[PDB]
Amino acid sequence: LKTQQEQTQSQLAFLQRKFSNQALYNWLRGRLAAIYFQFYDLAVARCLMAEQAYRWELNDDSARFIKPGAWQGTYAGLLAGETLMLSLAQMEDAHLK
Amino acid sequence: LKTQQEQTQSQLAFLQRKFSNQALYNWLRGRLAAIYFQFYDLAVARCLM
Amino acid sequence: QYLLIDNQVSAAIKTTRIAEAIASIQLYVNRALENVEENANSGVISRQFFIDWDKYNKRYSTWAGVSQLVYYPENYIDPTMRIGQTKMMDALLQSVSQSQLNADTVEDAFMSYLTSFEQVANLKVISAYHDNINNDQGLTYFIGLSETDAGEYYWRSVDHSKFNDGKFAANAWSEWHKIDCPINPYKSTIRPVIYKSRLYLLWLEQKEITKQTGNSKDGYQTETDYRYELKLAHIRYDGTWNTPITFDVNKKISELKLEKNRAPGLYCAGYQGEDTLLVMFYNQQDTLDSYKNASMQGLYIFADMASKDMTPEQSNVYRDNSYQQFDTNNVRRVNNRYA
Amino acid sequence: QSQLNADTVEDAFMSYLTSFEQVANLKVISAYHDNINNDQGLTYFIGL
Amino acid sequence: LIGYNNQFSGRASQYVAPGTVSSMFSPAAYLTELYREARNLHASDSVYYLDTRRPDLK
Amino acid sequence: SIDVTFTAFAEDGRKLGYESFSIPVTLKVSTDNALTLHHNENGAQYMQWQSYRTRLNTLFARQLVARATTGIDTILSMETQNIQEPQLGKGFYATFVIPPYNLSTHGDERWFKLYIKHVVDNNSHIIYSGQLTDTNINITLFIPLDDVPLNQDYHAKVYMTFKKSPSDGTWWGPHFVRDDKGIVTINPKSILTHFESVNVLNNISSEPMDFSGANSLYFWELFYYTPMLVAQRLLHEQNFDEANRWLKYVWSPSGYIVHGQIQNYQWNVRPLLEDTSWNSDPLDSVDPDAVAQHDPMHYKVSTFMRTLDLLIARGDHAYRQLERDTLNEAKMWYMQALHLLGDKPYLPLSTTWSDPRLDRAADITTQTLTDLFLPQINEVMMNYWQTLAQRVYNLRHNLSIDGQPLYLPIYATPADPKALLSAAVATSQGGGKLPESFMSLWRFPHMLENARGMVSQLTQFGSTLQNIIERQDAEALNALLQNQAAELILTNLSIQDKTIEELDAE
Amino acid sequence: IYATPADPKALLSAAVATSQGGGKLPESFMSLWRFPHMLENARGMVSQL
Amino acid sequence: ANRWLKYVWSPSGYIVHGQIQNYQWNVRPLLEDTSWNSDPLDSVDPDAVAQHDPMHYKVSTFMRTLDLLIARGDHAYRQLERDTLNEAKMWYMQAL
Amino acid sequence: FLPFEGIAIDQGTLTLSFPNASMPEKGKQATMLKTLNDIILHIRYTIK
Prior knowledge:
The structure is cut from a larger assembly and holds 9 copies of chain A. Chain A is mainly alpha-helical. Helix content of chain A is 71%, strand content 0%. The first copy, chain A, has 3 helices and no strands. In chain A, α2 runs parallel beside α3 (80-96). The longest helix of chain A has 36 residues, at 22-57. Chains in contact: A-B, A-D, A-F, A-G, A-I, B-C, B-F, C-D, C-E, C-F, C-G, C-H, E-F. At the C-F interface, α5, α6, α7, β1 and β13 of C face β3, α1, β9, α3 and α6 of F. β13 of chain C pairs antiparallel with β3 (35-39) of chain F, so a sheet runs across the interface. It is classed as toxin. The entry lists the keywords Complex, Holotoxin, Photorhabdus, Insecticidal, toxin.
């Protein structure tokens, strides 16, 4: 049992010392989350510029395709990209029709 | 055994309160499935065009 | 700036008498709204017309657009583009959007919609606050409570600008919004207030605490002494609530001695400006006439979460100016801002 | 990471300050000045 | 019954051209709305009172 | 007031004099009333603040849920909308019938207003407003009462003004008195001159689902906006017949059949059926749905227009096939739209204007025209006759939808059967639904590349979804396994206790 | 002298977009580029997202 | 942006604990020291120069306040309606 | 997008400004303008 205890502590030390540890992921998540959010705002701005071009070419100033709900504060903003991809596609499809 | 019981409960509580929990996936599936279907209809229409 | 007309403009510019009138006045309003002019009437500034100044009313083109929009709304309204769509409508739409649109798809979406509704369809309304000083304008905030818990508080608000011939527009009302703060108020004393243009809750709760030992030998204390703690918490822009700030209000409550089954009435209203909150306690009466020359306690809470006692010379002023807002037995009143 | 607003910065400030508190009052043990004259260059300090 | 002038009819009973001051959407209407809302922004004995600054608008 | 004294002295200390000023300071507080919250014995909750009482909750949410389990036709029925709620407080319901518009009385303008007085004060309050029609307007109002009446002859007064006779004379409106046992009668000293009839609905202690209450928003989404939304999407998809069926849930010209019986109404949403008159004093908002849902007439009109849009669209769809037979079909669709519109109303323009001074122009309503300014025509609605007239004109003059001449053969060239078959086969697959294959301006290789890009994006969402699903199931399993572990440990704890008892037995 | 009334339909879609959750919609800047150019750029930006 | 600048500089003053204050600068080192430093720091780092002589931030803050007013005016100017040109004018007058 | 693209054919005003036109000021374009008989615009527009 003492041997098992030492082995258990060895595994804990391993988890702490191995490179791909909790600290790494805490750091990667914090950094990527900052990037992802900032990238999202830029993505929205471009989506809106495409929307503005749409409105100018097709003389219709009422149309809106980009919705404000793509980024959820909860669920870490996941699927904001996918949400925007759909709305861009809808706009493109409207353009063709 | 009581200790094991408590540990079992902390593992369960962990799963419930970890970010990537069942609620997350239920939510992601719901939202994505709606996107996927809508995207499909647009895709079909373009394929047809 | 004083005469609201430009005396340096070239003669090359043409106008009309009406057009200049609608210019001098626009400047007048903007200077008042921007507090360039030091003492505008707060009971006028708060009016809905001015609230909408920056979206529609400040320009003829947008004013005219809106006036037509709401005169013949049938030409513009659309089920997919409207103000006030509920979170439950989002749920219907997300479910419907996953498949083919037909009757069966909507029947299942509706069952989810309706059960979601049922859960907040009948909360007990506990208390409320009006964020204007006039009862015909601004919003009333309500706190409700599920019949299934002591927790499960929800907030809601109604827009009184949408009130007209004895009734409110359907979308004058917000939905119920769940509060995740573990509030355990004493005798449902909790009251909402708008402070710093945020929704804050404040309530009393009793901290049950006493000496465990009786005579410090063989003996015990009965149950608890009751410390009255005033808790204050607010909504984050995340939609969640923060951790409450605790204030000591025990001497005030004891001075206004109540019986064992009572809570002090908790009067609370925002001072119209300066992010100063007016908190008063009173021994709730059977009639409003009993508040005339009544003894009341209170404190000022500042944006810096610190407070000062009200001196009775001032608490008497708020008492006299704000009565008929105080609760009495058998009624509950919605408080409002103090200006 | 999120919207810029008052609460976003309040949370950030709390973290800023706790990181600060940890090294806000170290005991300075010793120091060394890199230059010849006291008016220029850098003084290095070690604290604990 | 059947028809736009049977259901939904009778509103207003008088109409005006879009180019007249009598229109509810005219700038005269806008001015009227601005004046009735702005005239009480200041105390009547204030130097900034609208009718003190501009006695002619009224 | 601030005591300000101006004084001065000489170089040798002699006083030169003084002047004393007093600067008044006036403090005002808007000492308004307070809104009051109530929770009644019958479970109703309400906010009362004047004579007005607003319902805050619903007691039948359970019934809605249960009805929905039986299908769309039960949740959207009229009976569902007749589920009643308890009345809010002491008071009664009464039916007022407003006489038809004429020029002997109610002359010049069609607006009228009903006011209630002596409920909580001796001031009046607007209770109801609207414009007079050519028929009887039948409305039900809840008349609240204060526990202690202002007058002893009557508990409340209701009266009508209409530009003519806006007098509020004593006994000009009905005076209502609450007798013992809650029976409300009309005090005989009062008269009904401005009313066709007034009926106190004694023994009615409840009313049908309130679309003006705090939860009305859910009822409007449930009964009005959802079916209109569904019809809209179906129309965009060209499911014209389905769109029709869905619009019929809200409005069905020719009426409805209920429990096999023939009904006498077209509007299937209670507030659209009710509120048959225009509101004479519109909501001062910036939100068009605050105005609609305040005055339901606006939805009735938008519903009407959606029906026309559908008929027109069926027409245009047929028009565009450019076959003599389909032009004839288009013609009937435009005729049905014209039939439904009926005659274009005559809308005279007025030239009367008083050139009022701005101060007088600033005439407001609070708590030679009544409304100094007049409305415009509403070209959006008038354009329906203009549009149909042009479409019909073109058909009658052998022109295309955009006014081009066309030279169609009298007898159409037979459709090629090989194409008819592949269309029939594609349709009869089960499901089989595909959207109209719209022809774009783009050549095949352009569209092919766009379609390929679109599909590869679809395959990416597909794999993403699959991964979510597999991960979702993995999460469920881990939760299951921990929940199971939690059960086995309890059994083991009980076994260990028995072991301890065995040792005590030893 | 008098501005053309704003189109009420555009005002409404703006109001809904503004009020329907958060309302933080970046200025809809108009660029020198035609719709298909901007669409391709936006699409690339989103797939990176 | 306007509200946030008032945490540093609020011309017209502040209310503290309900009291009307006698200052505009809300940063203690900018509130103190109204005198320009006659011995400017001989550095290459403008932030070491500022702070050392706090007058420099007071001026940059002033400039940011003006930039905000001008920008509000510019935004309005560009809408090209008489109403917005009139609005732009007040913003420029406020800046002046 | 091309300059002026998207402007309604029946709205607004065009201005053609010739700098340095005044003759008393000896502007460079002062003499050019005295040989200019007309101004011709070629407008391409579309109907949609």
